Design a protein around this ligand. Sequence first.
Ligand SMILES: *[C@@H]1O[C@H](CO)[C@@H](O)[C@H](O)[C@H]1NC(C)=O
Ligand SMILES: *[C@@H]1O[C@H](CO)[C@@H](O)[C@H](O)[C@H]1NC(C)=O
Ligand SMILES: *[C@@H]1O[C@H](CO)[C@@H](O)[C@H](O)[C@H]1NC(C)=O
Lengths: 58, 290, 99, 49
Amino acid sequence: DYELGFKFSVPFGGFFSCIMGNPLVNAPSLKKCPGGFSQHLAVISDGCQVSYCVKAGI
Amino acid sequence: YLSNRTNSRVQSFGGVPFYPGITLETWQKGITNHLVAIDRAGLPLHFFIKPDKLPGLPGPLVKKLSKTVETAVRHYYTFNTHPGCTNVDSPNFNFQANMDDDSCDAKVTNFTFGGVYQECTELSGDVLCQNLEQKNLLTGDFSCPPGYSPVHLLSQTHEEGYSRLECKKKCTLKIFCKTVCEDVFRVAKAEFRAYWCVAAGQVPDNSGLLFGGVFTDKTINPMTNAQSCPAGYIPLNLFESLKVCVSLDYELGFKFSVPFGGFFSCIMGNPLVNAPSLKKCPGGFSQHLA
Amino acid sequence: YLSNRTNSRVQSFGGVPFYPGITLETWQKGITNHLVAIDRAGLPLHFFIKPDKLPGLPGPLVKKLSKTVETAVRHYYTFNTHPGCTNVDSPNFNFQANM
Amino acid sequence: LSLGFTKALMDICDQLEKNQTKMATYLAELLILNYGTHVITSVDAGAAL
Ligand SMILES: *[C@@H]1O[C@H](CO)[C@@H](O)[C@H](O)[C@H]1NC(C)=O
Ligand SMILES: *[C@@H]1O[C@H](CO)[C@@H](O)[C@H](O)[C@H]1NC(C)=O
Ligand SMILES: *[C@@H]1O[C@H](CO)[C@@H](O)[C@H](O)[C@H]1NC(C)=O
């Protein structure tokens, strides 16, 4: 819901594991962190780290 | 063969000085004073430097002052506000009209040699591979990251025995069968092959990271002066007893990183210089035991 | 193969500092003070900026003032009242005459 | 503001009026080392275990 999300959203993105690919750019030609968002850990799964590209805009 | 193993860890802040036999109550009733700030929120101090909050003073001059204080913060915030050098640590050969407390044990000027990697090889049985598997994080499996080299840190072997599980059924003469559960001794062995990960050359900052923090359960971590991982660090248990902490994120690492390098055992080689022609400590960093 | 699994979670606000062995009573009797606002209702503060509630001041000017305060709220309400940028977080490279 | 805080602040201000940038910026750096980079406006008196 919009209600308090509009001010508490942190408009994230997405990112696969460090071994898997990525959804966004930095036609499958790229495979690495989708843009910026350096390794801000969220969870480890048997060796691979799962992170995102969490934008914090307006 | 009986073996208890008990742990316990209270961690209170803050009430009456804790002690094991204490009730869960006399703790509470004794909280009258002994209160502690469990959560706090404030503002950047530059916000409080404003002509209203200040007594009689020239208007635009307090704007100047606020900007100066804020820039000083900025300096102290991003890096250690360095005009010329780190100053207070070992005040001998430093420019000390500023303030700067980076670190003291620096002996090398090597580059950002990130990465963490190893190899857990089994010699016999299947016991030790499941827990000595300190697989690489930067790749999600046994590999180095691109631009780095998984050069062999150290090989080592261990010999432990576990009375395994055995619940097997045995037929007597193909008519009836019995299940003869009989757990058997077995000395398993695993050859622990550590492979220190080091960058090959200039790193792209998109996928080249800096880290820091190494200690055992017995050796203290002088990095954090503790026996655990500092905040924002996964303790990667690369070694037999080491938990190599990872600066997986920039956030506080930029100011608490200590941009390490790598080094094999004194019998094994080394990753950096002081085309395999050299075998001795990679550069400086005299024997600072880990 | 036996396996108990117990949970427990009290969440009180607000009486005497809770503790497990407490009765459901000594909680109550000890509520003499230790009261807490469990529910509240009020008005938007722009409503309270009116010439009657204010001391001697120019009439239309308090209308101006109420409109300004209300617009400031509006700004702070919808988005984070941004003239130029996010300011207090990491005050290094931000335009920080706003909030 | 506190007394010591105002003292340090108007000291840096006298340094800037006295045009001595180096001593001024060093005094500001000392201020930030001596009074932290943020002032607290809210705490929660409690305890945990
Ligand atoms: C410790 O070992 C004893 C036997 O000596 C056993 O009865 C007990 O369950 C074990 N654990 C504890 C917590 O005492
Ligand atoms: C816990 O396990 C015991 C057996 O040790 C059983 O008697 C009891 O019902 C279980 N549950 C609780 C709440 O004690
Ligand atoms: C202060 O220093 C600046 C830069 O050197 C100079 O232009 C100015 O004349 C000095 N004095 C005053 C009062 O600003």
